[PDB]
Ligand binder design. Structure first.
Ligand SMILES: CC(=O)N[C@@H]1[C@@H](O)[C@H](O)[C@@H](CO)O[C@@H]1O
Length: 330
């Protein structure tokens, strides 16, 4: 937790070079991907090794939303697309089972957090699609609040994304960054405002999206979006993540070093450099030695094994119900 930088590792086991870089104080987390996941035991061993190499507390995170975005599937309960809960007759009840189950099984495998939930509105943006909980404000709020309650219940920190709303985004040749040219995105942002005000988000990830009515920069590299709006207008007090600086970020600024500088000056607390070990190293060398003490809030609050978890009727039911829900609409 201590440092701002999130990076990844190459495979199923920690390398000797991994063990060295994990000790760099500017590192605060490892983001895991599908290529880091083979099986439950291998995952447990990998995370144990990460925490031992780091020595100090360190965050381990994953994109585990359900549906199209679930890095760990084999040997885990399948989680439905976030869209599916609101299609069921008891959606709010099931959304909480989905969030609880997703979070519980990650904690059982020594993972601190999932970069979830998606608070975007609508299904028309290809990148989002059925990752959204609904296509109007109330449906999104109702079902995302349930999912959040489930995460909270097991001690997992929560991350709203992709602020200030990725639901209506276009990524064609009209501009060089995905964009949303609407004169107002008030409804999209109202979802974020509501969850911020309810105090249910520990963290926030911004969208790599330009909203030209508002500001020239992608929100993820925008002083307006991340300070003026997110902090001053909206009163968000949690952790702000960057986007993946390796393929997103303020691309016009230059390389990883320039993108990292812009993310931090814009108001990100923590920065992500994925898929590019040599870029992570470059950024570590460029930056001051940095600390993010408030990121300790993101470390998981509970500890238990998968065996212990499965003894809960709550697990027995949630797991079965998620499989039913998937089968109901797939
Ligand atoms: C629009 C989109 O999918 N953005 C993703 C985000 O959800 C994810 O948490 C992050 C880390 O993998 O990479 C991206 O920025």
């Amino acid at each position: 937790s201590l440092g701002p930088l999130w990076l990844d590792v190459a495979g199923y086991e920690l390398s000797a070079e991994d063990r060295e870089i994990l000790q760099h104080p500017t590192v605060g987390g490892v983001i895991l991907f599908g290529r880091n996941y083979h099986d439950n035991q291998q995952l447990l061993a990998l995370n144990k090794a990460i925490r031992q190499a780091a020595k100090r507390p360190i965050l381990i995170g994953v994109d585990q939303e359900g549906g199209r975005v679930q890095r760990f599937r084999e040997g885990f309960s399948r989680i439905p697309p976030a869209q599916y809960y609101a299609r069921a007759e008891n959606g709010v009840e099931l959304a909480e089972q989905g969030g609880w189950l997703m979070a519980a099984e990650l904690i059982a495998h020594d993972v601190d957090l999932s970069f979830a939930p998606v608070l975007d509105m609508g299904f028309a943006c290809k990148a989002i699609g059925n990752r959204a909980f609904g296509e109007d404000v109330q449906t999104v709020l109702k079902h995302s609040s349930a999912f959040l309650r489930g995460m909270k219940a097991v001690g997992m920190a929560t991350t709203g994304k992709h602020f200030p709303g990725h639901g209506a985004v276009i990524a064609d040749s009209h501009l060089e960054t995905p964009y949303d040219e609407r004169e107002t995105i008030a409804q999209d942002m109202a979802i974020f405002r509501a969850q911020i005000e309810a105090g249910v988000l520990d963290a926030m990830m911004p969208a790599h999206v330009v909203y030209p009515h508002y500001d020239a920069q992608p929100a993820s590299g925008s002083s307006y979006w991340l300070k003026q709006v997110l902090r001053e207008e909206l009163g968000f007090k949690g952790i702000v993540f960057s986007d993946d600086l390796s393929m997103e970020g303020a691309a016009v600024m230059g390389g990883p070093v320039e993108r990292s500088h812009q993310a931090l000056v814009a108001g990100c607390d923590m920065i992500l450099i994925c898929n590019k070990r040599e870029a992570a190293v470059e950024v570590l060398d460029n930056l001051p030695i940095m600390e993010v003490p408030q990121a300790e809030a993101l470390l998981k609050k509970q500890q238990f094994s998968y065996s212990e978890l499965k003894r809960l009727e709550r697990w027995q039911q949630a797991s079965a119900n998620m499989q039913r829900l998937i089968e109901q609409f797939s």
